[PDB]
Amino acid sequence: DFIGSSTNLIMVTSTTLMLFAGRFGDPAGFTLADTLACGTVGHIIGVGVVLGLKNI
Amino acid sequence: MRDLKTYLSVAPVLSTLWFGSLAGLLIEINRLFPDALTFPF
Amino acid sequence: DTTTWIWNLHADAHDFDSHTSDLEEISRKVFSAHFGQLSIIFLWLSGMYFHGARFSNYEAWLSDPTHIGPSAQVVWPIVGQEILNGDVGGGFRGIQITSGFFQIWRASGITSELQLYCTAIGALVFAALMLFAGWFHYHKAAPKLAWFQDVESMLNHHLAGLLGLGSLSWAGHQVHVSLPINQFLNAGVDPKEIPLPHEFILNRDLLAQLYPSFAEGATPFFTLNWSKYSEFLTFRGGLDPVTGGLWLTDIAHHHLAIAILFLIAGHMYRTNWGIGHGIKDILEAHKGPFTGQGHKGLYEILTTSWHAQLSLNLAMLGSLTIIVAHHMYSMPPYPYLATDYATQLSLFTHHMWIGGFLIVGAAAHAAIFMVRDYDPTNRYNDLLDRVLRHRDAIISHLNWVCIFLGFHSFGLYIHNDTMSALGRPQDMFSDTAIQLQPVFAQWIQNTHALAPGVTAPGETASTSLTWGGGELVAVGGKVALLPIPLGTADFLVHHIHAFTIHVTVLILLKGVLFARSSRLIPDKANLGFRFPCDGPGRGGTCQVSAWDHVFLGLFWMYNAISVVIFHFSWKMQSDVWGSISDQGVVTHITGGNFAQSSITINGWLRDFLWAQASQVIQSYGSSLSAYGLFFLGAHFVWAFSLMFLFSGRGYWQELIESIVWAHNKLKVAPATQPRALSIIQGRAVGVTHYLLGGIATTWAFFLARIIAV
Amino acid sequence: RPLWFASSQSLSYLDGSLPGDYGFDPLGLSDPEGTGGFIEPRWLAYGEIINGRFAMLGAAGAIAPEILGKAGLIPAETALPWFQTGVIPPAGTYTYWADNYTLFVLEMALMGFAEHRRLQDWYNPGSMGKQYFLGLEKGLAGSGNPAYPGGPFFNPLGFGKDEKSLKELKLKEVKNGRLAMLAILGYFIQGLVTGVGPYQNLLDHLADPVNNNVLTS
Numbered sequence A: 001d002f003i004g005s006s007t008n009l010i011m012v013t014s015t016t017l018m019l020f021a022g023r024f025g026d027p028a029g030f031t032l033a034d035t036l037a038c039g040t041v042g043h044i045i046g047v048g049v050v051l052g053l054k055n056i
Numbered sequence B: 001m002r003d004l005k006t007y008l009s010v011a012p013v014l015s016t017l018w019f020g021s022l023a024g025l026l027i028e029i030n031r032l033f034p035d036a037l038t039f040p041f
Numbered sequence C: 001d002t003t004t005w006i007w008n009l010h011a012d013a014h015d016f017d018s019h020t021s022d023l024e025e026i027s028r029k030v031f032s033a034h035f036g037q038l039s040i041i042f043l044w045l046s047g048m049y050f051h052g053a054r055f056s057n058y059e060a061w062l063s064d065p066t067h068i069g070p071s072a073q074v075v076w077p078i079v080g081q082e083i084l085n086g087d088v089g090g091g092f093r094g095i096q097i098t099s100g101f102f103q104i105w106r107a108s109g110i111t112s113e114l115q116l117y118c119t120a121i122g123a124l125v126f127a128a129l130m131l132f133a134g135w136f137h138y139h140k141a142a143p144k145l146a147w148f149q150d151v152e153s154m155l156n157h158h159l160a161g162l163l164g165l166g167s168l169s170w171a172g173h174q175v176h177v178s179l180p181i182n183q184f185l186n187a188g189v190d191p192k193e194i195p196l197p198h199e200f201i202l203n204r205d206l207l208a209q210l211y212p213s214f215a216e217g218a219t220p221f222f223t224l225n226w227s228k229y230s231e232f233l234t235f236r237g238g239l240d241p242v243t244g245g246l247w248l249t250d251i252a253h254h255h256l257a258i259a260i261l262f263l264i265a266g267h268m269y270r271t272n273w274g275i276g277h278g279i280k281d282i283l284e285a286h287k288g289p290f291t292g293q294g295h296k297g298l299y300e301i302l303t304t305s306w307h308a309q310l311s312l313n314l315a316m317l318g319s320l321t322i323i324v325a326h327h328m329y330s331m332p333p334y335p336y337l338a339t340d341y342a343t344q345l346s347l348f349t350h351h352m353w354i355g356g357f358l359i360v361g362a363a364a365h366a367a368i369f370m371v372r373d374y375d376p377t378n379r380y381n382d383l384l385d386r387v388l389r390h391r392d393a394i395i396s397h398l399n400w401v402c403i404f405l406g407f408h409s410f411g412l413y414i415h416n417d418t419m420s421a422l423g424r425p426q427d428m429f430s431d432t433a434i435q436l437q438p439v440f441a442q443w444i445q446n447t448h449a450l451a452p453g454v455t456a457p458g459e460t461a462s463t464s465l466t467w468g469g470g471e472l473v474a475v476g477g478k479v480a481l482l483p484i485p486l487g488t489a490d491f492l493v494h495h496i497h498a499f500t501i502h503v504t505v506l507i508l509l510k511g512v513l514f515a516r517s518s519r520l521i522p523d524k525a526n527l528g529f530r531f532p533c534d535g536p537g538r539g540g541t542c543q544v545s546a547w548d549h550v551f552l553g554l555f556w557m558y559n560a561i562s563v564v565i566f567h568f569s570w571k572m573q574s575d576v577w578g579s580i581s582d583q584g585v586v587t588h589i590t591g592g593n594f595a596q597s598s599i600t601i602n603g604w605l606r607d608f609l610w611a612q613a614s615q616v617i618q619s620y621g622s623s624l625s626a627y628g629l630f631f632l633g634a635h636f637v638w639a640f641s642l643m644f645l646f647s648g649r650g651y652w653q654e655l656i657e658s659i660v661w662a663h664n665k666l667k668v669a670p671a672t673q674p675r676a677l678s679i680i681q682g683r684a685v686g687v688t689h690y691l692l693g694g695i696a697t698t699w700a701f702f703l704a705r706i707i708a709v
Numbered sequence D: 001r002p003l004w005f006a007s008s009q010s011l012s013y014l015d016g017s018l019p020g021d022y023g024f025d026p027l028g029l030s031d032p033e034g035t036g037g038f039i040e041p042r043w044l045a046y047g048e049i050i051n052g053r054f055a056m057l058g059a060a061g062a063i064a065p066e067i068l069g070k071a072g073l074i075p076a077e078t079a080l081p082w083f084q085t086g087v088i089p090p091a092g093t094y095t096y097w098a099d100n101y102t103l104f105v106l107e108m109a110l111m112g113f114a115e116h117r118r119l120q121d122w123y124n125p126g127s128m129g130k131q132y133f134l135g136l137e138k139g140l141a142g143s144g145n146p147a148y149p150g151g152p153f154f155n156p157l158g159f160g161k162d163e164k165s166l167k168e169l170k171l172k173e174v175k176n177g178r179l180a181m182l183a184i185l186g187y188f189i190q191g192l193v194t195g196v197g198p199y200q201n202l203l204d205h206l207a208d209p210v211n212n213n214v215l216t217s
C-alpha cells in the first residue's frame, strides 16, 4: 500500500545519499557510529523535506 | 557504643532533649489547668 | 579555651577546600553533599503530598474551585490557638494555603485522595534510597578524579537523558492521562464519576470517543501523516475560557517539541567513539576579529576549580528564576490560577527573592575564586588579564552611570512632590502636564498584538493578553487577564529599577575586580578573602575585603527587589484584578489610582502603604490574626538588627569584663572564657536580622491584604 | 581465536583466560581501570555464569507445560502458558495446596539458606566446610573457584577429569547460557506484545508463515 509513494522514495534517497556522502574490518575505517550518525542525519533531512513538501 | 553515649552528652543534643521535655511538661499543665490567672489554693 | 571556638565550628563546617588540599576528596564530599540535599528535598515533597491527602479539603475544592479556599493545615486546640481554624468553605476549617498545590494536582489529573497517599509513600522511599546512595558513594565506592573531569560525557547525559527524556515522558503522561480527565472535568462531570486513568489505556474506544484520532493507532506517526494528530496537538494560543489557563494540548505539543530538540542537542560533544566536538578544541580554535588569540586557557580553569563553576551556575540559575517569575503571571499555565489572586501574588514574590539571593552568591563565589584559585603562572588566561589591566576605566564609567540614573530618576519624583506641594500641578511630569511616554514599549505591544495573522499564520490568538488589542477574560465573575496600559507612571519606575540594578552591579563588580589588590593595599591577596580591615592607617581601611563588598551588596539587592514587588502589587491591584458585573462593567480593587497617585513619594506613603495596611492591623480576633502577630514581630527583628550594625566590639568586651568580674565574685566563673563576637561576625549577624525582618514584614503585609480582599 | 566486534581497548585486558571470550566489549564495562562496587571483572564473569544457568533452567521450564499439553500427556487444567500459572495474579491464577504467599515465604527461606551459603563461600574461600552442618560440611568445601565448586555434591558423575575436556565443556556451557538468556528476553517481549504463549506463537507462525509475522502485529 504505502510502498512506492513519494515519501518512501524521498527518504530512501535522502538516507542513501547522506550515507554515500559520509563514506566518500571496513577498508576505509567507516565505524558503525559513523553509519548510525549519517543514517540519522539523512532521516531528519528527509522528514523535514517531506513535511515541508506535504504542505504545498 | 561509647561514642554513641559521648555524642549524646554533647551540649546541643542534651539541651534539645531537656527543652523538649520541658515544653511537653508545660503543655501538660496548660492542658490540665487551662485559663489560669490566680492560685485558688 | 574561649567561646570563639564554638562560633568558628559552625562557620567552616562546609568549607572543604580549607580542610584538605586534594581535589579528589573535595569532589567526593561535594557528591555526597548533593545526595543529602536531594534526600531532604524528596522528604519535603513527601510531606507536602501527604498533608494534602489527610488534612485538606481537596475534593470539595475540586467540586467547586471558585468559591472554596484551598487549605492543607490544621491546628491543635491547646492554648486557645484554634482561632486560626477559619471557615474556608467546603465544611472544613483550617489555614488557607497559597502555594498553588491544588492547581498542580488538578492539572495532573488527580481526582481522589488515594493517589496522593501513593505519591507520598513513593517519595519517602526515594528519600531513603538517596540517603543510602550518598552513604554508599562516599564510604564504599568513591569515584576517582578522572571520572569527575569528563565534562563531555556529563553534558551529553544531562542534556539527552535528564532533560531530553524527562520532557518526553511528561508529554506521554499528559497525552495519556491529563487531557481526557481534564476534558471530563471541564464538561461538568462530577469528579467521582470520572473513569480511572488506566481505563483510558486499557479501553481504547473510550479514548476514541473523545478524540477520533486515537482509533487510527500509531500508524500515522510512522507514515508521516502527522496532520491526523491535530485533535490533541494544537497551536491555538491564548487562555482557556472555561478555566483561565493555557490549553493543555498546547502544553503537550510544547513538551514534545522540547524533548525532541534536547535529544538532538545532546549528541554534540565527543566521547570514546570519536564523533562530535571537543570543548577544548572549540574554545581554542575560536578567534574572532577583536579577541585576537582567543579563549585559550579556560578549559583548565573551569575543570580544576569548583568556585568558578559554582559562580557561573548560580548566576544562570538566578536569571532563570527571575525569568520564570515574570513568565508565569502573564501566561497562567494551571487551571483556576489567574482568578485566584492570593496564589498569584505569592508565586511572583517568592522567585524574585530566590533569584536575587542566587545572583549575590554568584558574585561572592567569583570573588572567592579570584582570591584563592587565581594563578597567572600555571593557569594563564588572556581575557582575564586584559580585564584586570584596565579595571580603573570599568569602575569609573559604571560609577558615572549610577549617578546619572539616580539623579534623572529620583529628582523627577522630588520635583513632582515639590510642585504638588507648592500648588502648581501644571508643572509636574504626569499624563496631564508634561508627558514622558514609553513609546518603545507601546510599539512592542502593538507589534505583538498584530503579529498573529500576519507574522504567525499558524497562531489563532496572541501569546498573552497583556499586549493591547485582545479581549477580556472572565472566570466565575472575576477578572483573569486584560491588556495592561503603559503611561508616564510606568516610565519612572522602570528607570528606578534600572538605577537600583546598576548600583548593585557596581558594588559587586568592584569587589570582584579589586579582590586581589588595589592602590591602597598592594598585598590584599595575602590577607585573605574574609578579613575585617588592615588597621587605622592610611586614614582608615575598614571593610576593604571582598566579603564586605558582598555584605554591602546584599542591602542593595534587598532594596532593589522590594521596589519590584511593590510595583507589581499596586499595578495589578489597580489595573487588572477586579470583578465584573452581569452587564460587563469591570470594577478594579483600588479603582485605577496608580496612574495619578504613583508619581509622587506622598502617593506611595498615603495611597499604598497607609491605605493597604488597614487589613493587617485589624486582623486581631479573626482567623488572620497570625499575620497581625507576625507583622509586629518582624519590626522587632528589623530594629534589633541595628544594634550589631551601628556598634563596635571594644565596648561589649569591656562590658563582658565587668560581668565576668561579678561572676568571679561568686565562684560561678566558667572555664570557657566569654568573648564578644568578632568584627566579621558582628556584621554577618546584623544583615541576617535586617533581611529577615524586612522580608517577614512584607510577607505578612501582602498575605493579610490579599486574602481578605 | 575468533574476534567479534573486538576493539583495541577491549583486547588489552581480555586476554582469553575466561571461557568463551570473543573480545566483544563496545562499552568497556569490564575495564580494569576504576574498578569498584559491583563493576569488577571477576564479579561480572560470575554474574554472567549464574544468570546463564538460571536462564537455561527457565527457558525449558516455561515452555515445558505447553509442549506436553497439546500431546495429551498432562491434564488441560495444568497446560497453562507461563504467565497464567499464578506468577501474575491479574493475568490468572491456579489453586495449589496453599495460597501464593506461603509458597513465597517457603521459597524465600530455602533459597535464602542456599544463596547465603554461596555468598559466604564467595567472600572467603573454603570456610563452608568447617562449621558443622548436619554432617554435610565435608562435601561443601568448594574448589577455590567460585563459579565451579565441584565436589561430590555438585559433580557426582565425574565429568571433565582432564583440563581440555573441562575447558570445552565450560565453553559449551557459556554458549548455551547466552542462547538461553536471549530466549528468555524473547519470551518476555513476545508475551508482552502478542498476548499468547510462545509455543502458540510458533504454531501460529508455522501454520501461515506469510501472515503471522512481526509486520502484521
Ligand code: CLA
Pocket: C010, C011, C012, C013, C014, C015, C016, C357, C358, C359, C360, C361, C362, C364, C368, C529, C530, C547, C550, C688
Ligand atoms: C548552591 C549554593 C551554594 C553553595 C553550595 C555554597 C557553598 C559555600 N559557600 Mg555560599 N552562598 C550562596 C550559595 C551557596 N554557597 C549564596 C546564594 C550566597 C549569597 C547570600 C552565598 C554567600 C556566601 C558567603 C558570603 C560565604 C559563602 C561561603 C561558602 C562556603 C562555606 C559555607 C559555609 O561554611 O556555610 C556554613 C553554614 C552556615 C553558616 C549556616 C548559615 C545559617 C543561615 C545564615 C541562617 C538561617 C536562619 C534560619 C532561617 C533560621 C533557623 C533557626 C534555627 C537555627 C533555630 C561553601 C563552599 C563562605 C566562604 O567560602 O568563605 C571562604 C562565605 O564567606 N557563601
Ligand code: CLA
Pocket: C658, C659, C660, C662, C663, C666, C668
Ligand atoms: C547557672 C549559671 C549561672 C549563674 C548562677 C548566674 C548568676 C548570675 N548572673 Mg549570669 N549568665 C549565665 C549563667 C549564670 N549566671 C549565662 C549562661 C549567661 C549567658 C547567656 C549569663 C549572662 C549574664 C548577664 C548578661 C548578666 C548575668 C548576671 C548574673 C548575676 C545576677 C543574677 C542573675 O540571675 O542574673 C540574670 C542572669 C541571666 C539572665 C542569665 C540567664 C540564665 C541562664 C540561661 C541559665 C543557664 C544555666 C546553665 C544551663 C547551667 C547548666 C547547669 C547544668 C550543667 C547542671 C548572677 C550572679 C548579671 C550581673 O549581675 O552581672 C554579671 C548580668 O548582667 N548573667
Ligand code: CLA
Pocket: C129, C130, C132, C133, C136, C141, C142, C143, D035, D036, D037, D038, D039
Ligand atoms: C546522580 C545519581 C547517580 C550517579 C551519577 C551515579 C553514578 C555511578 N554509580 Mg550509582 N547509584 C545511584 C545514583 C547515582 N549513581 C543511586 C540512587 C543508587 C541506589 C543506591 C546507586 C547505586 C549504585 C551501585 C550499587 C553501584 C553504583 C555505581 C556507580 C558508578 C558506575 C555506574 C556505571 O558504570 O553504570 C552502571 C549502570 C548499569 C549497570 C545500568 C543499571 C540500570 C538501572 C538498573 C536502571 C534504573 C531503573 C530506574 C529505577 C527506572 C525508573 C522508573 C520510574 C518508575 C522511577 C557511577 C559512578 C557502581 C560502582 O562501581 O560505583 C563506583 C555500583 O556498583 N551505583
Ligand SMILES: CC1=C(/C=C/C(C)=C/C=C\C(C)=C\C=C\C=C(C)\C=C\C=C(C)\C=C\C2=C(C)CCCC2(C)C)C(C)(C)CCC1
Pocket: A019, A035, A036, A038, A039, A040, A043, A044, A047, C260
Ligand atoms: C553496501 C553494503 C552494505 C550496506 C548497508 C548499509 C549502507 C546500511 C545502512 C543503514 C543505516 C546506516 C541506517 C541508519 C539509520 C539510523 C537512524 C534512523 C537513527 C535514528 C533516528 C532517530 C532516533 C530519529 C527520530 C526522530 C523522531 C522519532 C521524531 C523527530 C524526527 C526524528 C527523525 C529526529 C551491507 C552492510 C549490507 C553489506 C556490505 C556492503
Ligand code: SF4
Pocket: C532, C533, C534, C535, C536, C540, C541, C542, C543, C679
Ligand atoms: S578596629 Fe574597627 S574601625 Fe578600626 S580599622 Fe579595624 S574594623 Fe575598622
